[PDB]
Amino acid sequence: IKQGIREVILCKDQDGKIGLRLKSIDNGIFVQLVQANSPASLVGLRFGDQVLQINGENCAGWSSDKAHKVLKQAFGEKITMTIRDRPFERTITMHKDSTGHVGFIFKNGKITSIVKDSSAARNGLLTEHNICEINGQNVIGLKDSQIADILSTSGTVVTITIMPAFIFEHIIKRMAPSIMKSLMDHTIPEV
Numbered sequence: 001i002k003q004g005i006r007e008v009i010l011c012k013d014q015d016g017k018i019g020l021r022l023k024s025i026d027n028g029i030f031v032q033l034v035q036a037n038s039p040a041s042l043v044g045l046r047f048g049d050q051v052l053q054i055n056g057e058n059c060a061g062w063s064s065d066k067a068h069k070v071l072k073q074a075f076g077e078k079i080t081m082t083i084r085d086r087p088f089e090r091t092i093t094m095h096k097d098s099t100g101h102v103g104f105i106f107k108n109g110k111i112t113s114i115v116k117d118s119s120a121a122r123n124g125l126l127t128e129h130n131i132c133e134i135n136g137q138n139v140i141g142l143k144d145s146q147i148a149d150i151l152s153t154s155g156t157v158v159t160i161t162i163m164p165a166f167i168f169e170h171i172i173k174r175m176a177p178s179i180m181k182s183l184m185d186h187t188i189p190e191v
């Protein structure tokens, strides 16, 4: 969660795509899906990110639909965006013990308990929070087993980005878990 507003410059691909779906939330506009191998994944857009401006025009109060139209009607050449970094999320750094545990239970990407005298507990991890990212990789809609795999194959230090479930549920409104398994970019960023 980078403290402030940054600017990104996008460029439609050969197919006129940027790779983005956006959701209206509390009169802001927020990133709902980022597509693998897309302009939006290259420039580093993330689920949860707020779009402040599109080409210098303010997004406040737009509907998802208007946001999507604005994007279609734009000269592919160069689309600027003003981004606030994942405003609804926090990042929690934890350390695995010698058993390789951090100390929580989660179900359907949702944390549901903290284990006494874990790092998770020492670190104030919260239940009723959806796991958005692990070690900077988006994990939304992967099966629980594959999240365990990512935690299990991780270094000792584990960084998790979480979002209040009521907010999370508002963003992904009416989506299958396997929709986002398919569509959401789950790669480590290129350098």
Ligand SMILES: CNS(=O)(=O)Cc1cc(C)on1
Pocket (backbone or CB within 6 Å): 021, 033, 172, 173, 174, 175, 179, 183
């Ligand atoms: C895969 N379909 S989508 O338009 O790209 C994102 C979305 C929004 C809602 C509601 O359900 N899915």
